[PDB]
Amino acid sequence: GSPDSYRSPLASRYASPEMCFVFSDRYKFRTWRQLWLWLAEAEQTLGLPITDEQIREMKSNLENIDFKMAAEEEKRLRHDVMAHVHTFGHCCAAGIIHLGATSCYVGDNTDLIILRNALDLLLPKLARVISRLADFAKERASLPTLGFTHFQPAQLTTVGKRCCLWIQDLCMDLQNLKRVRDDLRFRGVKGTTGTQASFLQLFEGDDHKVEQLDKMVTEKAGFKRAFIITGQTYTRKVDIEVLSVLASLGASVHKICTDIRLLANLKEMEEPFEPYKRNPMRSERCCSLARHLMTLVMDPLQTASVQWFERTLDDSANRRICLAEAFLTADTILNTLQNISEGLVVYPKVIERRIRQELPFMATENIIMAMVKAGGSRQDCHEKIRVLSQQAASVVKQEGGDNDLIERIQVDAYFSPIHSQLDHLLDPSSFTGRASQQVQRFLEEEVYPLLKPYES
Amino acid sequence: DHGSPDSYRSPLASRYASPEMCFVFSDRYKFRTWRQLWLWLAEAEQTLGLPITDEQIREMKSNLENIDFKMAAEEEKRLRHDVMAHVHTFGHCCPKAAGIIHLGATSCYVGDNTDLIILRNALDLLLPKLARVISRLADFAKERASLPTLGFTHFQPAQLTTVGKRCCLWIQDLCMDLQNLKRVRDDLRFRGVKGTTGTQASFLQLFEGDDHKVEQLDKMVTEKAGFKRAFIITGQTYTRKVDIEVLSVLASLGASVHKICTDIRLLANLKEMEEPFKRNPMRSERCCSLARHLMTLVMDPLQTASVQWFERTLDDSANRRICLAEAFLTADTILNTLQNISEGLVVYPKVIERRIRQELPFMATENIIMAMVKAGGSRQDCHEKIRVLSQQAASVVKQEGGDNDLIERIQVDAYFSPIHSQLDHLLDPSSFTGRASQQVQRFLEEEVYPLLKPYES
Amino acid sequence: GSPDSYRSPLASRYASPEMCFVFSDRYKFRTWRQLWLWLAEAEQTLGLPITDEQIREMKSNLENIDFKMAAEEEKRLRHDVMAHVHTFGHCCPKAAGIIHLGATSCYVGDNTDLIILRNALDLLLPKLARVISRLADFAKERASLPTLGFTHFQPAQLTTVGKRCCLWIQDLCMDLQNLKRVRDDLRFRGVKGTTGTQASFLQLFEGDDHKVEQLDKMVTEKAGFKRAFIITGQTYTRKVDIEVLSVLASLGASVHKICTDIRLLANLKEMEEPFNPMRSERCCSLARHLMTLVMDPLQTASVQWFERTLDDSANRRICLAEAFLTADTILNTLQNISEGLVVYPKVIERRIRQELPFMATENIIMAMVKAGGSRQDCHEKIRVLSQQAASVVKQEGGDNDLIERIQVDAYFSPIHSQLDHLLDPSSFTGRASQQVQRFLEEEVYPLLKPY
Amino acid sequence: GDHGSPDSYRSPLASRYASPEMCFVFSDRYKFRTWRQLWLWLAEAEQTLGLPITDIREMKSNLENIDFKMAAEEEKRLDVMAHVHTFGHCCPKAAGIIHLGATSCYVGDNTDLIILRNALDLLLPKLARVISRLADFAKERASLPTLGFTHFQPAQLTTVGKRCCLWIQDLCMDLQNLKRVRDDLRFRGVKGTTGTQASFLQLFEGDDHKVEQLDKMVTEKAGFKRAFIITGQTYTRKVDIEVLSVLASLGASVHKICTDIRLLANLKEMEEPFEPYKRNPMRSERCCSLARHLMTLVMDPLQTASVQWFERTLDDSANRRICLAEAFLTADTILNTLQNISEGLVVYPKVIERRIRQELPFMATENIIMAMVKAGGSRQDCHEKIRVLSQQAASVVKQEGGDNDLIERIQVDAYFSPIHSQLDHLLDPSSFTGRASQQVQRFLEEEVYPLLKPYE
């Protein structure tokens, strides 16, 4: 709000409103009231003294939270969970709110619901990007381009084939995100140290009633599975599995955008339009943010390593930051990446220019093989070809002119039984190998199947 | 081998890790596998109609272990190439196969596929080790399932848990590691034959435009390698995302192990539990030190994957020769040392009982107020009456450094008339542990044993 | 702040209003205007057609910022700096033609970051010194009070409370020195142009090489810096950010160490936080994040291509502010902790008493030899009385009774009864109290002098 | 070459990569030798203070003679006492005055500090040598115009010498950091089990002054100017942080330089030294790989010091043996390879000139309009004419993949007749370099040469 105070650039400038809502106070305190409703619903079903009038008024007061009252009662009573019990019970039921449960019933189950929801926003966005990159890869599947190893010219590839290297990495990320989201489990009702003591007390020693309660709220929260063993909170290892797959996504994006930045210099490919000089500013923002995601991994790792026994509260402040800032960063990244993918501009003639410069240095083997087939001796042909290439290399390096190796093998009499066959031995398409067929097979076997559920 | 004391010894090779994992990352295994990959290539190429004879095949199959490391290093100096040097040395012990070795292949066919074979082997040696650790902790967790111990939140006295339940926190964290390790081993895919830029250009020229034969070759060497699946899309090498996926689980494992051993170290101070053999928990401190390094190593493959330009840059080669090996050798040492810890953790039941009885009356107060309504007495007048006696009892403990005298105060107090006779039953340690004992039994049978079953051998 | 939107907890819950302001858009764009004024003033002196009316106009409108207009212009122009040049030129109609004259974007953007970095360090420095000041008082007060030393977190030769506090102080002192050096050696970017060659300023002064050097000197002195970079690309070297976040990350490691000890002492009931050690848990949590952040500028500086790549911007806008707001929060909480550390001597005594006999056995032997005793016929006589006591402590879970077993054996009769002068807790503390004395007088107080 | 069988894992940092000097610094031979040298200094200093010690010569002559089997046997039977016994066998005359009243960390921890300082002393001259070589190159190419790069897009011309200065300045800040950390490195001395000097206070019979004189004497004998007053068992693990922080900062600088060389290699502007036609910057690639590891190693000591409980805990021992040794072996290798790259950088002036002429015309438009106004032309007419001709040239480059013909278009247009004679001056590369050459001379004389003078 105020420009007098520091404002998170991930919150006020970079990320989408959708992701910002999930990590807001309004959504957190709404979920708190939502978890209290489910607790009361399941407790009434199991025989605890709860009247239907207490339930209906909690149901009609889910999105009616007084912040001015809650903020000052938190300053008055120190504890934040109990401060929200008072505020809910004021617009309500008061006697049955949070009965038996501890602070971490709302706080910790909210985090897993927030976590599951945030992953649910990233998935269709990642698929959307992949889909748009897939169309680009299919369109440019046969357009030959100079391949790079050590960032030096190497055996030709296609523009579509190069794109599939990016697509694959994102397809592993989609799969990883989906797995982690599906594997996410509910804490349930566990108590102060995970022994379920206070809940067992209310049900007066009934062990089956506690287990039924643990299955009831888990299904109301939309989780398939619920933890058996926990300390106070869910194991902090969960936060590692989630941030690992995001950091991996960060690495992928960084590689993709660095490729695009290098292609922008070669003037072979640029970012979509709204001038001669164009900076790839969106890819650079992406690289910047991806880096943050890779850094973020050390936070949950260090945390879980130093949790003592059932729970130490030195996870609280660190998780408030790293978890939201992981998803806000990933969110910005995917919005930007989606923007970049919508009509990447390719300049074919610039690509054709770079090929015809380096191509003759790679086609030398084809020439000799064509001399042998006619009747020329390999040994003698190798010595007479490894001499015109050193001349043509000198012109390029020492003098800074265009490549003229093809001309020199047209003005040499020794290479007379090849002059008619030269413009076929230099067809760029006959140097791309199985590149176009690799795209074909990859998109149908691996890419399209994964995109199928996300068709919308 | 244990080299001269004049040179630096890497402690992960001799000082710590098991000779098995050391061998998987050795030059012998590396170059035996190189020659194996050349044998599978020749066999499959002979199947596809290339001029290779049975005699040439038997020659390669016989000389697989016959490696001259001295000559290969000397030829590497001259030829300025590691692979083409080993092609020459293999051709020297195989004079008839010399012509067909590495036909159509590029450097990474042997270089990069060997690292995939190394990864899968290295994971398959870690799994049984991680499972034996889980098993012995599951033995321990069953024995001590109903042994009350003071629970710690904020490392401060809280409601009672059991020793078995505390062990299950450790068990679960290692159980998710087992699942993650398995999943990564199964997801590993063979690179196969791809050529210098992944376009299979060289092999397509060998079969002379025959696209079907090239894809046939790729499947053939993959099956011979024992891989269910191979990549369709690579540059020169398999995507360096695979390193991230592997080392992310080892780093995560390290975080769980570091937690387990920090917990054990703290218990050793409390005298509640100690390691097998004034004693120092050196082996838990050894585990912590190494787990830390295992967590640190994750930033390497992360950064490596982020700066790989196009189809490949060699700015990953040296880094991978360090991070991958060390991660597994570190991961190896940890689980060998952790296995020795889990085999016989010593519990001191009487020391645990002492700490419980000096903290229990402060959390048994609620049961008293509920118990006092049998007569009965008022809820609010009793809440303040027992509250102030705790203020006097906690003052002798902290401000004067003594023992808990709260029980002594209530027994002589005239106000607490009826409750006297049922106090020992009210302070029953088992009636504070909740469902801890039932949580232990269910966790082991529902989740632990089904996971450990495939490792009966 | 809005409840419907996410808010960075460091700005709305944790850090001080002082630190939050140094990283605000108000401070940022005011400094932009502050740097444009200096440039104009120096350009006038060097002979450019700028009137005092124009400078007077600029000096009057440093704080008069229209953010609404500045945001609308950036959407249109797709440029941060030019938008603010236009907005400043709107409330300064006469100076509009001379704002940002011959300058590049990074003259404001990059020099502002350096100004912000220096200012933020200048707020952390007094706060750190003040923490060290009160921890020094605590170290002097409890300098002689013996406490059980811990190696491997196991009872070892007893030290003193003040001595253990000095281990904390020494780490923080090193931080204070490292924060001072980084702030003092921090340099100004100055005027460098788009690629660091000063080509555009050279053209404005129509070739006059000396005038470009003077303009660089003048804006540096006006900014309050002692030194400027001679060599830069577009921006100051990103190595600078590494050095700053390195000292802060190291400070995080120190803070986490101090707060872990406090968290362990609270468990042992030997020391307490002023009120669960929740303040030390908040400190540990944030210190952890401060250590994480060092990897950002490291990766950022490693992949800077040539004269500059813009893949540093968004990351720095996150990692720099977050580091300082975190650091600020930590020190604030550490101040509160240091104001009210409560020691409980009696609990310390009790723990000492049940471990002192296990560490005093060597002095008993040394007092038995010259009293007429054998070196093995006494060592065995006491070591058996240590085996039975180790069972009472560990197998039975009771009190340590080696302080009881003296009358039991008639062998130790010459020892009756000059003790417990031999079991004096102060006689096992070594040079702990002298070491505290020297440390404060030679190393700590000289550092806290000019604060 | 060193020894090791191919049947076990041999760390490439020791056997394959680093130079023999650094390997010896972290070897067992140097570790145990320094132990005995520290034991000697202890006896000699205790002799000067009054303790019953006589001619010292025996320990002096038996420093090189170490039996590793005897030490390993006693290590299996009982490491410090295993070496007290081994050094107390081949020295029969003196065995009751070795390690007298000292703890396991007098040798083990002070050795760790003599190694660190030895390792830094090998690095310093090596880093100075690289700066010196690069500086020579920078002076030689200080007035050689090259294309400036921002966003890796064409920008205001700089010089080759100037770009080199950006690298030098990074390394110069590294040399400063290393000198400061090495000089401010303190000795642990004598402290005892928990750092109170109790064991020594007993054997000097309560003498305060004598304990403090022993601290100064072994500090002076070790080559240190200063000793710690306050330490626990070992020196504060903050020391590891500061050492590896600056090393991590060096790896970042090296990565930047070597990424630059690699990119220049693709532009064919600059190349690694000889000993064609395709050449790979494999040496710069090795450096980036190794520098990356060096940047990673920083979290090790960071995590270590943060979880040190009280006086000392030995969960640092295994981590420090790895991380410290690795960092200095990696730093050493990097600087050895970076010495190679510096030694005979190949520059291709004509390739550099070709790139400039392709990008300069677009940047030179301001000067052309200035020259046209200077002759009697209109500002608007010239700006519109130069606008239509620049967009025509941009199409030829982008859409057609041809050379930059902007100057040709100006040269054939009759409107530009007033400046046709001026064109070979208006587009002089040197006039676009700004003050680059002057910055090089000033930087080298005021910062580099003073900094290198002590290292001469």
DSSP string, B238-250: --THHHHHHHHHH
Interface check for D30 against chain A (CB to CB < 8 A): the answer is no
Backbone angles phi, psi at B246, to 5 degrees: -75, -55
Regarding whether D168 and D93 lie in a shared domain, the answer is no
Regarding whether C136 and C154 lie in a shared domain, the answer is yes
From D100, D121, D155, the end of a domain falls on: D100
Regarding whether D154 and D62 lie in a shared domain, the answer is no
Q: Do C196 and D263 touch (CB under 8 A)?
A: no
| A2 within domain boundaries | no
Interface check for C347 against chain B (CB to CB < 8 A): the answer is yes
Residue in A160, A134, A162 with CA at minimum distance from that of residue A148: A162
Mutation choice for C interface testing from D185, D230, D284, D317 by most C CBs within 10 A: D230
Give Cα B365 distance to the centre of its chain: 44
Mutation choice for D interface testing from B78, B260, B315 by most D CBs within 10 A: B315
The set of chains that have 3 or more CB pairs under 8 A with C is: A, B, D
Q: Do B322 and D24 touch (CB under 8 A)?
A: no
Q: Which residues of B are annotated as a binding site for substrate?
A: 15-16, 80-82, 106-107, 236, 286, 312, 317, 321
Q: Do B348 and C264 touch (CB under 8 A)?
A: no
Round to whole Å and give the CA distance between D120 and D175: 10
Angle between helices D238-266 and C161-184 (to 10 degrees): 30
C91-150 residues touching A, CB cutoff 8 A = none
Query: Which pair of structure tokens corresponds to residue B405?
Result: 């005298």
Residue in C236, C126, C127 with CA at minimum distance from that of residue C189: C236
CATH number of the domain where residue B351 is located:
1.20.200.10
Regarding whether D248 and D126 lie in a shared domain, the answer is yes
Task: Evaluate the CA torsion angle A304, A306, A311, A312 in order and state its sign.
Answer: negative
CATH number of the domain where residue B98 is located:
1.10.275.10
| A1 within domain boundaries | no
Contact assessment for residue B352 and residue B150, using Cβ atoms and an 8 Å cutoff: yes
Q: How many domains does chain C have?
A: 3
Q: Do D351 and A280 touch (CB under 8 A)?
A: no
Round to whole Å and give the CA distance between B266 and B152: 11
Interface check for D291 against chain B (CB to CB < 8 A): the answer is no
Q: What share of chain A is helix, strand, coil (3-state, %, to 5)?
A: 70, 5, 30
**A288 is annotated as contributing to ligand binding:** no
Contact assessment for residue C319 and residue A10, using Cβ atoms and an 8 Å cutoff: no
Regarding whether C389 and C362 lie in a shared domain, the answer is no
Compare all CA atoms of chain B with the CA of C343 and give the residue at the minimum distance: B399
* Chain B residues with CB-CB distance to D14 below 8 A: 7-10
Distance from CA of C60 to the nearest CA of D (A): 34
* Chain A residues with CB-CB distance to C291 below 8 A: 298, 302
Long-range Cβ contact pairs of D370-375 (< 8 A, separation 24 or more): D371/D418, D371/D419, D371/D422, D371/D426, D372/D416, D372/D418, D372/D419, D375/D418, D375/D419
B68 by Cβ neighbours in 10 Å (0-12 / 13-18 / 19+) ranks as middle
Query: Which pair of structure tokens corresponds to residue D103?
Result: 């703890």
**A103 is annotated as contributing to ligand binding:** yes
Q: Is the peptide bond before D9 cis (omega within 30 degrees of 0)?
A: no
Query: Which pair of structure tokens corresponds to residue C89?
Result: 């030129």
Q: How many CB atoms lie within 10 A of CB A2?
A: 12
* Chain C residues with CB-CB distance to D197 below 8 A: 430-431, 435
User: How would you classify the pairing of strands B148-153 and A345-346?
Assistant: unpaired
Contact assessment for residue B293 and residue D322, using Cβ atoms and an 8 Å cutoff: yes
Residue in C10, B412, B189 with CA at minimum distance from that of residue A175: B189
Round to whole Å and give the CA distance between C316 and D51: 60
Distance from CA of D12 to the nearest CA of A (A): 22
| D113 within domain boundaries | yes
Q: Running DSSP on this structure, what letter comes out for residue D83?
A: H
Q: Which residue reads 């787990």 in tokens?
A: B291
Interface check for B155 against chain A (CB to CB < 8 A): the answer is yes
Distance from CA of C220 to the nearest CA of B (A): 37
A144 strand-pairing partners: A158
Contact assessment for residue D346 and residue D137, using Cβ atoms and an 8 Å cutoff: no
| A3 within domain boundaries | no
* Chain D residues with CB-CB distance to C257 below 8 A: 305-308
Q: Do A194 and B262 touch (CB under 8 A)?
A: no
* Chain C residues with CB-CB distance to D157 below 8 A: 195, 197, 199
Entry field: residues in chain B? 457
Q: Running DSSP on this structure, what letter comes out for residue B29?
A: H
* Chain A residues with CB-CB distance to D403 below 8 A: none
Residues of B catalogued as catalytic: 154
At residue D204, the 3 state secondary structure works out as: coil
Q: Do A278 and D307 touch (CB under 8 A)?
A: no
Interface check for B74 against chain D (CB to CB < 8 A): the answer is no
Compare all CA atoms of chain A with the CA of D308 and give the residue at the minimum distance: A306
Sequence-distant (≥ 6) Cβ neighbours of residue C181 within 8 angstroms: none
Q: Do D303 and B295 touch (CB under 8 A)?
A: yes
Contact assessment for residue A117 and residue B164, using Cβ atoms and an 8 Å cutoff: no
Round to whole Å and give the CA distance between A36 and A17: 27
For the question of residue D151 being annotated catalytic, the response is yes
Regarding whether B280 and B255 lie in a shared domain, the answer is yes
Regarding whether C226 and C154 lie in a shared domain, the answer is yes
Regarding whether D312 and D184 lie in a shared domain, the answer is yes
- Catalytic position from the list C84, C86, C90, C152: C152
Regarding whether B90 and B157 lie in a shared domain, the answer is no
How far are the Cα atoms of C375, C408, C421, C427 from residue C371, in angstroms, in the given order? 12, 19, 16, 20
Q: How many CB atoms lie within 10 A of CB C74?
A: 17
From B70, B103, B136, the end of a domain falls on: B103
From A99, A114, A136, the end of a domain falls on: A99
| C383 within domain boundaries | yes
As a dihedral over the C-alpha atoms of residue A388, residue A391, residue A397, residue A402, rounded to 10 degrees, the angle is: -70
* Chain B residues with CB-CB distance to C345 below 8 A: 401
Sequence-distant (≥ 6) Cβ neighbours of residue D127 within 8 angstroms: D171, D174, D175, D178, D250, D335
* Chain C residues with CB-CB distance to D433 below 8 A: 197, 199
Contact assessment for residue B257 and residue B336, using Cβ atoms and an 8 Å cutoff: no
Q: Do B269 and C153 touch (CB under 8 A)?
A: yes
Please name the helix (run of DSSP H) or strand (run of DSSP E) that holds residue B276, with its range, or none: none
* Chain B residues with CB-CB distance to C398 below 8 A: 354
Round to whole Å and give the CA distance between A264 and A275: 14
At residue B346, the 3 state secondary structure works out as: strand
| D3 within domain boundaries | no
Regarding whether B259 and B204 lie in a shared domain, the answer is yes
Round to whole Å and give the CA distance between A357 and A404: 8
Closest CB to A193: pick one of B161, B299, B302: B161
Regarding whether D187 and D119 lie in a shared domain, the answer is yes
Contact assessment for residue A177 and residue A125, using Cβ atoms and an 8 Å cutoff: no
Entry field: residues in chain A? 456
Q: Is the peptide bond before D316 cis (omega within 30 degrees of 0)?
A: no
| B349 within domain boundaries | yes
Query: Which pair of structure tokens corresponds to residue A398?
Result: 């020492």
How many Cβ pairs within 8 Å bridge chains A and C?
A: 153
User: How would you classify the pairing of strands B346-347 and B273-274?
Assistant: antiparallel
Contact assessment for residue C194 and residue C234, using Cβ atoms and an 8 Å cutoff: yes
Round to whole Å and give the CA distance between C424 and C434: 18
| B357, amino acid identity | R
Q: Which residue reads 């030694």 in tokens?
A: D343
Sequence-distant (≥ 6) Cβ neighbours of residue B384 within 8 angstroms: none
Interface check for D229 against chain A (CB to CB < 8 A): the answer is no
| B1 within domain boundaries | no
Q: What is Dmax (Cα atoms) for chain C? A: 105
How many Cβ pairs within 8 Å bridge chains A and D?
A: 83
Q: Do B299 and C303 touch (CB under 8 A)?
A: no
Contact assessment for residue C425 and residue C356, using Cβ atoms and an 8 Å cutoff: yes
The set of chains that have 3 or more CB pairs under 8 A with B is: A, C, D
Regarding whether C325 and C233 lie in a shared domain, the answer is yes
Full residue range of the structural domain in which residue D406 is found = 378-418
Q: Which residues of C are annotated as a binding site for substrate?
A: 13-14, 78-80, 104-105, 234, 282, 308, 313, 317
Q: Do C299 and A294 touch (CB under 8 A)?
A: yes
What's the CA angle centered on C324, arms C319 and C325, to 5 degrees? Answer: 100
CATH number of the domain where residue A389 is located:
6.10.250.1570
